[PDB]
Amino acid sequence: RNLAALEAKISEAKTKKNMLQARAKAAKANAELQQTLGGLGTSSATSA
Amino acid sequence: DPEKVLEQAVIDMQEDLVQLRQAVARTIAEEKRTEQRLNQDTQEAKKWEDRAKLALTNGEENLAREALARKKSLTDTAAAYQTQLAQQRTMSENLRRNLAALEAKISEAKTKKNMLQARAKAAKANAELQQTLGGLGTSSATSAFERMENKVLDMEATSQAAGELAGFGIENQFAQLEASSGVEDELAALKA
């Protein structure tokens, strides 16, 4: 019974962390795309 | 270690049961030898009685009484060896009963300790399995999740910093884009 509970805890913890890491990486990638789409070189164009 | 001490006690008991086997075997030989002595003394007592019968047949009562005095000495010596033998018989049975009790005590003590050691080892093995099934790495997993949560809070703080900064003209440009989309819908209605 301890082994069955241990395997369940390991499996759930591993898969939950893996999908959380994947979604966190996707979320920060989208945030950097929106930030870089905002942060255009408008001051350099204005200086020209 | 108590397991090494009780194993040494069982080894010492193997030496003791060999010493008691020797003491029994010696006592068995002493009873058999004193039986042999009294048996041959009583056969010599018969020879001296027959020597007396020969003397009486010849009329020599002097030699007959002398031969009967050898008979008396031999039968009294055989009675002394029977008395000595009675002490050997009781000692032989005492050592026999002590050996039977000793072997029973050794056998029971050895097997009871062996099964107690086996059950104690199985019990502590199960206790360590239940302890290790409880004692999982949950603090290390939580520390990894806390590092990811700190990076999520950095993205929330970055989103708050962008949200306070990003007040721009572009919202009025989106109202002009929606007006231009309305002109394309009016051109579509004209085409229809």
PDB file of C-alpha atoms in Angstrom:
ATOM      1  CA  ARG A   1       0.000   0.000   0.000  1.00  0.00           C
ATOM      2  CA  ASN A   2       2.900   2.401   0.733  1.00  0.00           C
ATOM      3  CA  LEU A   3       4.475   1.563  -2.684  1.00  0.00           C
ATOM      4  CA  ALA A   4       1.162   2.111  -4.546  1.00  0.00           C
ATOM      5  CA  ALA A   5       0.714   5.501  -2.793  1.00  0.00           C
ATOM      6  CA  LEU A   6       4.407   6.426  -3.422  1.00  0.00           C
ATOM      7  CA  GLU A   7       4.126   5.674  -7.183  1.00  0.00           C
ATOM      8  CA  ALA A   8       0.878   7.694  -7.418  1.00  0.00           C
ATOM      9  CA  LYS A   9       2.497  10.692  -5.597  1.00  0.00           C
ATOM     10  CA  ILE A  10       5.628  10.552  -7.823  1.00  0.00           C
ATOM     11  CA  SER A  11       3.606  10.269 -11.071  1.00  0.00           C
ATOM     12  CA  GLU A  12       1.216  13.134 -10.230  1.00  0.00           C
ATOM     13  CA  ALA A  13       3.974  15.438  -8.873  1.00  0.00           C
ATOM     14  CA  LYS A  14       6.238  14.852 -11.929  1.00  0.00           C
ATOM     15  CA  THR A  15       3.477  15.422 -14.521  1.00  0.00           C
ATOM     16  CA  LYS A  16       2.005  18.503 -12.715  1.00  0.00           C
ATOM     17  CA  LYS A  17       5.472  20.148 -12.463  1.00  0.00           C
ATOM     18  CA  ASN A  18       6.287  19.281 -16.117  1.00  0.00           C
ATOM     19  CA  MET A  19       3.048  20.870 -17.462  1.00  0.00           C
ATOM     20  CA  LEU A  20       3.476  23.891 -15.101  1.00  0.00           C
ATOM     21  CA  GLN A  21       7.055  24.419 -16.441  1.00  0.00           C
ATOM     22  CA  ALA A  22       5.796  24.102 -20.057  1.00  0.00           C
ATOM     23  CA  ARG A  23       2.892  26.586 -19.502  1.00  0.00           C
ATOM     24  CA  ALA A  24       5.177  29.037 -17.609  1.00  0.00           C
ATOM     25  CA  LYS A  25       7.716  28.965 -20.520  1.00  0.00           C
ATOM     26  CA  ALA A  26       4.904  29.518 -23.075  1.00  0.00           C
ATOM     27  CA  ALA A  27       3.438  32.387 -20.964  1.00  0.00           C
ATOM     28  CA  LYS A  28       6.807  34.242 -20.641  1.00  0.00           C
ATOM     29  CA  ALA A  29       7.493  33.679 -24.382  1.00  0.00           C
ATOM     30  CA  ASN A  30       4.134  35.353 -25.255  1.00  0.00           C
ATOM     31  CA  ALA A  31       4.843  38.186 -22.737  1.00  0.00           C
ATOM     32  CA  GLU A  32       8.279  38.832 -24.385  1.00  0.00           C
ATOM     33  CA  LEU A  33       6.612  38.816 -27.864  1.00  0.00           C
ATOM     34  CA  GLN A  34       4.035  41.445 -26.720  1.00  0.00           C
ATOM     35  CA  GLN A  35       6.818  43.492 -24.999  1.00  0.00           C
ATOM     36  CA  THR A  36       9.065  43.426 -28.135  1.00  0.00           C
ATOM     37  CA  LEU A  37       6.051  44.326 -30.379  1.00  0.00           C
ATOM     38  CA  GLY A  38       5.497  47.397 -28.088  1.00  0.00           C
ATOM     39  CA  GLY A  39       9.235  48.310 -27.700  1.00  0.00           C
ATOM     40  CA  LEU A  40       9.860  49.421 -31.350  1.00  0.00           C
ATOM     41  CA  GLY A  41      12.766  51.746 -32.429  1.00  0.00           C
ATOM     42  CA  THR A  42      10.502  54.883 -32.690  1.00  0.00           C
ATOM     43  CA  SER A  43      13.098  57.180 -30.975  1.00  0.00           C
ATOM     44  CA  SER A  44      15.776  56.235 -33.596  1.00  0.00           C
ATOM     45  CA  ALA A  45      13.306  56.833 -36.479  1.00  0.00           C
ATOM     46  CA  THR A  46      12.277  60.189 -34.864  1.00  0.00           C
ATOM     47  CA  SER A  47      15.997  61.155 -34.535  1.00  0.00           C
ATOM     48  CA  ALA A  48      16.522  60.508 -38.292  1.00  0.00           C
TER      49      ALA A  48
ATOM     50  CA  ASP B   1      26.047  -8.056  19.809  1.00  0.00           C
ATOM     51  CA  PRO B   2      23.360 -10.292  21.450  1.00  0.00           C
ATOM     52  CA  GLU B   3      23.013 -12.560  18.342  1.00  0.00           C
ATOM     53  CA  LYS B   4      26.791 -13.314  18.425  1.00  0.00           C
ATOM     54  CA  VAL B   5      26.642 -13.944  22.221  1.00  0.00           C
ATOM     55  CA  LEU B   6      23.702 -16.409  21.925  1.00  0.00           C
ATOM     56  CA  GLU B   7      25.377 -18.166  18.933  1.00  0.00           C
ATOM     57  CA  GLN B   8      28.583 -18.520  21.041  1.00  0.00           C
ATOM     58  CA  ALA B   9      26.452 -19.919  23.926  1.00  0.00           C
ATOM     59  CA  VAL B  10      24.954 -22.510  21.475  1.00  0.00           C
ATOM     60  CA  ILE B  11      28.535 -23.382  20.284  1.00  0.00           C
ATOM     61  CA  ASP B  12      29.682 -23.796  23.947  1.00  0.00           C
ATOM     62  CA  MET B  13      26.609 -26.059  24.467  1.00  0.00           C
ATOM     63  CA  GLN B  14      27.922 -28.316  21.613  1.00  0.00           C
ATOM     64  CA  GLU B  15      31.172 -28.754  23.596  1.00  0.00           C
ATOM     65  CA  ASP B  16      29.209 -29.422  26.845  1.00  0.00           C
ATOM     66  CA  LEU B  17      26.940 -32.092  25.252  1.00  0.00           C
ATOM     67  CA  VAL B  18      30.109 -33.847  23.922  1.00  0.00           C
ATOM     68  CA  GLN B  19      31.627 -33.762  27.468  1.00  0.00           C
ATOM     69  CA  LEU B  20      28.397 -35.208  28.953  1.00  0.00           C
ATOM     70  CA  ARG B  21      28.337 -37.932  26.203  1.00  0.00           C
ATOM     71  CA  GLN B  22      31.909 -38.854  27.270  1.00  0.00           C
ATOM     72  CA  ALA B  23      30.850 -38.937  30.975  1.00  0.00           C
ATOM     73  CA  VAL B  24      27.862 -41.226  30.120  1.00  0.00           C
ATOM     74  CA  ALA B  25      30.080 -43.519  27.973  1.00  0.00           C
ATOM     75  CA  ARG B  26      32.684 -43.741  30.801  1.00  0.00           C
ATOM     76  CA  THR B  27      29.952 -44.513  33.389  1.00  0.00           C
ATOM     77  CA  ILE B  28      28.460 -47.191  31.042  1.00  0.00           C
ATOM     78  CA  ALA B  29      31.919 -48.827  30.818  1.00  0.00           C
ATOM     79  CA  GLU B  30      32.346 -48.733  34.652  1.00  0.00           C
ATOM     80  CA  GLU B  31      28.957 -50.456  35.259  1.00  0.00           C
ATOM     81  CA  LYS B  32      29.738 -53.096  32.556  1.00  0.00           C
ATOM     82  CA  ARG B  33      33.244 -53.728  34.047  1.00  0.00           C
ATOM     83  CA  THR B  34      31.958 -54.103  37.648  1.00  0.00           C
ATOM     84  CA  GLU B  35      29.215 -56.479  36.345  1.00  0.00           C
ATOM     85  CA  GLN B  36      31.978 -58.462  34.558  1.00  0.00           C
ATOM     86  CA  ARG B  37      33.995 -58.611  37.842  1.00  0.00           C
ATOM     87  CA  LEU B  38      31.074 -59.856  39.998  1.00  0.00           C
ATOM     88  CA  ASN B  39      30.021 -62.332  37.277  1.00  0.00           C
ATOM     89  CA  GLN B  40      33.514 -63.929  37.155  1.00  0.00           C
ATOM     90  CA  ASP B  41      33.838 -63.849  41.013  1.00  0.00           C
ATOM     91  CA  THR B  42      30.535 -65.791  41.316  1.00  0.00           C
ATOM     92  CA  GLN B  43      31.765 -68.305  38.668  1.00  0.00           C
ATOM     93  CA  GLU B  44      34.973 -68.782  40.753  1.00  0.00           C
ATOM     94  CA  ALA B  45      32.695 -69.201  43.830  1.00  0.00           C
ATOM     95  CA  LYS B  46      31.023 -72.155  41.972  1.00  0.00           C
ATOM     96  CA  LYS B  47      34.519 -73.627  41.218  1.00  0.00           C
ATOM     97  CA  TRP B  48      35.460 -73.424  44.929  1.00  0.00           C
ATOM     98  CA  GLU B  49      32.099 -74.992  45.915  1.00  0.00           C
ATOM     99  CA  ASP B  50      32.801 -77.902  43.500  1.00  0.00           C
ATOM    100  CA  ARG B  51      36.345 -78.155  45.023  1.00  0.00           C
ATOM    101  CA  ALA B  52      34.595 -78.472  48.428  1.00  0.00           C
ATOM    102  CA  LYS B  53      32.260 -81.233  46.999  1.00  0.00           C
ATOM    103  CA  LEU B  54      35.374 -83.137  45.791  1.00  0.00           C
ATOM    104  CA  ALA B  55      37.003 -82.687  49.243  1.00  0.00           C
ATOM    105  CA  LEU B  56      33.796 -83.996  50.981  1.00  0.00           C
ATOM    106  CA  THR B  57      33.718 -86.963  48.507  1.00  0.00           C
ATOM    107  CA  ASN B  58      37.315 -87.762  49.650  1.00  0.00           C
ATOM    108  CA  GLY B  59      36.271 -87.174  53.354  1.00  0.00           C
ATOM    109  CA  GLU B  60      38.646 -84.134  53.748  1.00  0.00           C
ATOM    110  CA  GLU B  61      36.332 -81.788  55.733  1.00  0.00           C
ATOM    111  CA  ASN B  62      39.402 -79.579  56.497  1.00  0.00           C
ATOM    112  CA  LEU B  63      39.925 -78.885  52.741  1.00  0.00           C
ATOM    113  CA  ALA B  64      36.129 -78.557  52.254  1.00  0.00           C
ATOM    114  CA  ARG B  65      35.895 -75.775  54.931  1.00  0.00           C
ATOM    115  CA  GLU B  66      39.006 -74.073  53.430  1.00  0.00           C
ATOM    116  CA  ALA B  67      37.425 -74.168  49.917  1.00  0.00           C
ATOM    117  CA  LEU B  68      34.119 -72.812  51.352  1.00  0.00           C
ATOM    118  CA  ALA B  69      36.159 -69.938  52.918  1.00  0.00           C
ATOM    119  CA  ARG B  70      37.289 -69.045  49.326  1.00  0.00           C
ATOM    120  CA  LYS B  71      33.573 -69.249  48.282  1.00  0.00           C
ATOM    121  CA  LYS B  72      32.613 -66.830  51.138  1.00  0.00           C
ATOM    122  CA  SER B  73      35.383 -64.362  50.160  1.00  0.00           C
ATOM    123  CA  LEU B  74      34.334 -64.407  46.468  1.00  0.00           C
ATOM    124  CA  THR B  75      30.551 -64.041  47.109  1.00  0.00           C
ATOM    125  CA  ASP B  76      31.208 -61.204  49.626  1.00  0.00           C
ATOM    126  CA  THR B  77      33.467 -59.518  46.992  1.00  0.00           C
ATOM    127  CA  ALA B  78      30.679 -59.947  44.382  1.00  0.00           C
ATOM    128  CA  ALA B  79      28.192 -58.334  46.863  1.00  0.00           C
ATOM    129  CA  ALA B  80      30.646 -55.398  47.299  1.00  0.00           C
ATOM    130  CA  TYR B  81      30.831 -55.040  43.463  1.00  0.00           C
ATOM    131  CA  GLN B  82      26.957 -55.248  43.303  1.00  0.00           C
ATOM    132  CA  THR B  83      26.817 -52.383  45.879  1.00  0.00           C
ATOM    133  CA  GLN B  84      29.375 -50.379  43.810  1.00  0.00           C
ATOM    134  CA  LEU B  85      27.349 -51.234  40.644  1.00  0.00           C
ATOM    135  CA  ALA B  86      24.155 -49.853  42.257  1.00  0.00           C
ATOM    136  CA  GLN B  87      25.954 -46.460  42.572  1.00  0.00           C
ATOM    137  CA  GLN B  88      27.081 -46.735  38.901  1.00  0.00           C
ATOM    138  CA  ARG B  89      23.482 -47.559  37.730  1.00  0.00           C
ATOM    139  CA  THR B  90      21.984 -44.541  39.550  1.00  0.00           C
ATOM    140  CA  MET B  91      24.794 -42.218  38.320  1.00  0.00           C
ATOM    141  CA  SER B  92      24.400 -43.601  34.742  1.00  0.00           C
ATOM    142  CA  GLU B  93      20.642 -42.818  34.835  1.00  0.00           C
ATOM    143  CA  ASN B  94      21.311 -39.360  36.408  1.00  0.00           C
ATOM    144  CA  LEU B  95      23.737 -38.449  33.571  1.00  0.00           C
ATOM    145  CA  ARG B  96      21.308 -39.948  30.947  1.00  0.00           C
ATOM    146  CA  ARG B  97      18.380 -37.819  32.262  1.00  0.00           C
ATOM    147  CA  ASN B  98      20.613 -34.712  32.529  1.00  0.00           C
ATOM    148  CA  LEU B  99      21.741 -35.193  28.875  1.00  0.00           C
ATOM    149  CA  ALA B 100      18.134 -35.601  27.626  1.00  0.00           C
ATOM    150  CA  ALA B 101      17.103 -32.407  29.498  1.00  0.00           C
ATOM    151  CA  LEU B 102      20.248 -30.546  28.257  1.00  0.00           C
ATOM    152  CA  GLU B 103      19.535 -31.450  24.587  1.00  0.00           C
ATOM    153  CA  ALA B 104      15.875 -30.378  24.959  1.00  0.00           C
ATOM    154  CA  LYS B 105      16.920 -27.007  26.531  1.00  0.00           C
ATOM    155  CA  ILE B 106      19.543 -26.368  23.794  1.00  0.00           C
ATOM    156  CA  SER B 107      17.142 -27.270  20.941  1.00  0.00           C
ATOM    157  CA  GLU B 108      14.255 -25.125  22.240  1.00  0.00           C
ATOM    158  CA  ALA B 109      16.486 -22.132  23.144  1.00  0.00           C
ATOM    159  CA  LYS B 110      18.263 -22.176  19.731  1.00  0.00           C
ATOM    160  CA  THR B 111      15.046 -22.436  17.669  1.00  0.00           C
ATOM    161  CA  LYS B 112      13.137 -19.811  19.764  1.00  0.00           C
ATOM    162  CA  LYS B 113      16.026 -17.294  19.444  1.00  0.00           C
ATOM    163  CA  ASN B 114      16.402 -18.012  15.687  1.00  0.00           C
ATOM    164  CA  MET B 115      12.674 -17.383  14.956  1.00  0.00           C
ATOM    165  CA  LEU B 116      12.678 -14.294  17.266  1.00  0.00           C
ATOM    166  CA  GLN B 117      15.698 -12.866  15.337  1.00  0.00           C
ATOM    167  CA  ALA B 118      13.967 -13.608  11.989  1.00  0.00           C
ATOM    168  CA  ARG B 119      10.644 -11.975  13.087  1.00  0.00           C
ATOM    169  CA  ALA B 120      12.481  -8.952  14.605  1.00  0.00           C
ATOM    170  CA  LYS B 121      14.406  -8.423  11.297  1.00  0.00           C
ATOM    171  CA  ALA B 122      11.151  -8.712   9.279  1.00  0.00           C
ATOM    172  CA  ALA B 123       9.357  -6.281  11.670  1.00  0.00           C
ATOM    173  CA  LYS B 124      12.110  -3.586  11.440  1.00  0.00           C
ATOM    174  CA  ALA B 125      12.267  -4.048   7.626  1.00  0.00           C
ATOM    175  CA  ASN B 126       8.484  -3.356   7.382  1.00  0.00           C
ATOM    176  CA  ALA B 127       8.831  -0.370   9.795  1.00  0.00           C
ATOM    177  CA  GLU B 128      11.631   1.125   7.590  1.00  0.00           C
ATOM    178  CA  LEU B 129       9.457   0.568   4.453  1.00  0.00           C
ATOM    179  CA  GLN B 130       6.507   2.445   6.079  1.00  0.00           C
ATOM    180  CA  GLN B 131       8.893   5.207   7.331  1.00  0.00           C
ATOM    181  CA  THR B 132      10.501   5.657   3.853  1.00  0.00           C
ATOM    182  CA  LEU B 133       7.016   5.658   2.184  1.00  0.00           C
ATOM    183  CA  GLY B 134       6.064   8.531   4.597  1.00  0.00           C
ATOM    184  CA  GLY B 135       9.429  10.418   4.349  1.00  0.00           C
ATOM    185  CA  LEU B 136       9.096  11.555   0.669  1.00  0.00           C
ATOM    186  CA  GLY B 137      11.042  14.541  -0.851  1.00  0.00           C
ATOM    187  CA  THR B 138       8.011  16.951  -0.653  1.00  0.00           C
ATOM    188  CA  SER B 139      10.153  19.904   0.632  1.00  0.00           C
ATOM    189  CA  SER B 140      12.493  19.637  -2.432  1.00  0.00           C
ATOM    190  CA  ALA B 141       9.494  19.474  -4.831  1.00  0.00           C
ATOM    191  CA  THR B 142       7.899  22.477  -2.996  1.00  0.00           C
ATOM    192  CA  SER B 143      11.223  24.409  -3.297  1.00  0.00           C
ATOM    193  CA  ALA B 144      11.247  23.823  -7.100  1.00  0.00           C
ATOM    194  CA  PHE B 145       7.563  24.940  -7.333  1.00  0.00           C
ATOM    195  CA  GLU B 146       8.460  28.044  -5.212  1.00  0.00           C
ATOM    196  CA  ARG B 147      11.234  29.000  -7.734  1.00  0.00           C
ATOM    197  CA  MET B 148       8.713  28.668 -10.617  1.00  0.00           C
ATOM    198  CA  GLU B 149       6.134  30.684  -8.563  1.00  0.00           C
ATOM    199  CA  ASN B 150       8.749  33.467  -8.038  1.00  0.00           C
ATOM    200  CA  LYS B 151       9.221  33.568 -11.880  1.00  0.00           C
ATOM    201  CA  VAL B 152       5.384  33.724 -12.313  1.00  0.00           C
ATOM    202  CA  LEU B 153       5.305  36.653  -9.809  1.00  0.00           C
ATOM    203  CA  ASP B 154       8.110  38.345 -11.862  1.00  0.00           C
ATOM    204  CA  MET B 155       5.866  38.038 -14.993  1.00  0.00           C
ATOM    205  CA  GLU B 156       2.917  39.472 -12.963  1.00  0.00           C
ATOM    206  CA  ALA B 157       5.143  42.389 -11.770  1.00  0.00           C
ATOM    207  CA  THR B 158       6.326  42.890 -15.411  1.00  0.00           C
ATOM    208  CA  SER B 159       2.645  42.900 -16.551  1.00  0.00           C
ATOM    209  CA  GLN B 160       1.753  45.471 -13.817  1.00  0.00           C
ATOM    210  CA  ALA B 161       4.722  47.685 -14.891  1.00  0.00           C
ATOM    211  CA  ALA B 162       3.595  47.474 -18.559  1.00  0.00           C
ATOM    212  CA  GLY B 163      -0.069  48.151 -17.546  1.00  0.00           C
ATOM    213  CA  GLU B 164       0.790  51.415 -15.692  1.00  0.00           C
ATOM    214  CA  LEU B 165       3.181  52.560 -18.511  1.00  0.00           C
ATOM    215  CA  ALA B 166       1.153  51.681 -21.675  1.00  0.00           C
ATOM    216  CA  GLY B 167      -1.338  54.641 -21.728  1.00  0.00           C
ATOM    217  CA  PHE B 168      -1.162  55.589 -25.456  1.00  0.00           C
ATOM    218  CA  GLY B 169      -2.804  57.296 -28.502  1.00  0.00           C
ATOM    219  CA  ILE B 170      -3.303  53.833 -30.122  1.00  0.00           C
ATOM    220  CA  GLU B 171      -6.784  53.441 -28.464  1.00  0.00           C
ATOM    221  CA  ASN B 172      -8.007  56.440 -30.564  1.00  0.00           C
ATOM    222  CA  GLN B 173      -6.261  54.832 -33.602  1.00  0.00           C
ATOM    223  CA  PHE B 174      -8.312  51.622 -32.939  1.00  0.00           C
ATOM    224  CA  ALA B 175     -11.497  53.787 -32.964  1.00  0.00           C
ATOM    225  CA  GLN B 176     -10.359  55.082 -36.429  1.00  0.00           C
ATOM    226  CA  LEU B 177      -9.678  51.435 -37.518  1.00  0.00           C
ATOM    227  CA  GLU B 178     -13.258  50.474 -36.467  1.00  0.00           C
ATOM    228  CA  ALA B 179     -14.577  53.526 -38.417  1.00  0.00           C
ATOM    229  CA  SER B 180     -12.576  52.343 -41.512  1.00  0.00           C
ATOM    230  CA  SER B 181     -14.053  48.811 -41.024  1.00  0.00           C
ATOM    231  CA  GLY B 182     -17.527  50.476 -40.965  1.00  0.00           C
ATOM    232  CA  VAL B 183     -16.679  52.146 -44.342  1.00  0.00           C
ATOM    233  CA  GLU B 184     -15.792  48.691 -45.809  1.00  0.00           C
ATOM    234  CA  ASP B 185     -19.177  47.352 -44.497  1.00  0.00           C
ATOM    235  CA  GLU B 186     -20.947  50.360 -46.158  1.00  0.00           C
ATOM    236  CA  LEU B 187     -19.083  49.567 -49.438  1.00  0.00           C
ATOM    237  CA  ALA B 188     -20.186  45.891 -49.052  1.00  0.00           C
ATOM    238  CA  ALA B 189     -23.827  47.072 -48.563  1.00  0.00           C
ATOM    239  CA  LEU B 190     -23.436  49.311 -51.690  1.00  0.00           C
ATOM    240  CA  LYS B 191     -22.070  46.269 -53.665  1.00  0.00           C
ATOM    241  CA  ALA B 192     -25.085  44.279 -52.351  1.00  0.00           C
TER     242      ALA B 192
END
